[PDB]
């Protein structure tokens, strides 16, 4: 996250860190807890990965430097990548992770609410993106979970900044014309959440953008409402 600040405990209790351990352990992506055994993230987080035994999913953690060999983590039972996701193309950048065991809910570990199928922003005027990703292009993973407030941009205006790519109705964009505040490398798969009437909901999944926090280059997110039929079907069928 570029231009953000340090979060406090319990602000973002759905945020998870998706890490891998081969010989060394590293944070790769964010994700959102959406039910007791389900994390929602980006499909591109699985491109160029070994099989799932490598993953360690941390929840209820604010600071990655607080993680030790004894810190509990979740393991993966199932990965459900959208059937129509193709890496070169980048549409349908969405994936479900089923955990090996359900998590107990606490103030620091609980699920984000989901939108209804076929929902529109606006109504979303107060949106935030979180993660442990780089704080500048060519930066490094941050220790304390970062937060930043970013306005949604219309698909028409987002499209003008991305002549080579089609901005579809299944994407949502967010950013400042002057840049300076954005998701970045390592924020993939994490949440774009908006507070409406006191309650937070998951509006987007961090996906792509040109560099990080450049002027006139908004972040692009998978629009969760446009995949609600898929999320429900896949999680019901598995459960």
């Amino acid at each position: 996250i570029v231009g953000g600040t340090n979060s406090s405990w319990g602000e973002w209790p759905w945020q998870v860190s998706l890490q891998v351990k081969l010989t060394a352990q590293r944070h790769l992506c964010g994700g959102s807890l959406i039910g007791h055994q389900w994390v929602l993230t980006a499909a591109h987080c699985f491109d160029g990965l070994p099989l799932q035994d490598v993953w360690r999913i941390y929840s209820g953690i604010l600071n990655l430097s607080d993680i030790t060999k004894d810190t509990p983590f979740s393991q993966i039972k199932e990965i459900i990548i959208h059937q129509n996701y193709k890496v070169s193309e980048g549409n349908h950048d969405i994936a479900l992770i089923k955990l090996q065991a359900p998590l107990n809910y606490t103030e620091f570990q609980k699920p984000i609410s989901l939108p209804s199928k076929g929902d529109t922003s606006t109504i979303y005027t107060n949106c935030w993106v979180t993660g442990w990703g780089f704080s500048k292009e060519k930066g490094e993973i941050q220790n304390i979970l970062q937060k930043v407030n970013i306005p949604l941009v219309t698909n028409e205006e987002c499209q003008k900044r991305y002549q080579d790519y089609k901005i579809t109705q299944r994407m949502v964009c967010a950013g400042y014309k002057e840049g300076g505040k954005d998701a970045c490398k390592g924020d993939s798969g994490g949440p774009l959440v908006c507070k409406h009437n006191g309650m937070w909901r998951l509006v987007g999944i961090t996906s792509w953008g040109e560099g990080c926090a450049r002027r006139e280059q908004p972040g692009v997110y998978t629009k969760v409402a446009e995949y609600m039929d898929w999320i429900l079907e896949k999680t019901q069928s598995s459960d």
Binding site: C29, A42, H44, D47, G48, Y165, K185
Partner: peptide, 10 residues
Amino acid sequence: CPARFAALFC
């Protein structure tokens, strides 16, 4: 994954 994506080896 293309460079526009945000995973560490895109």
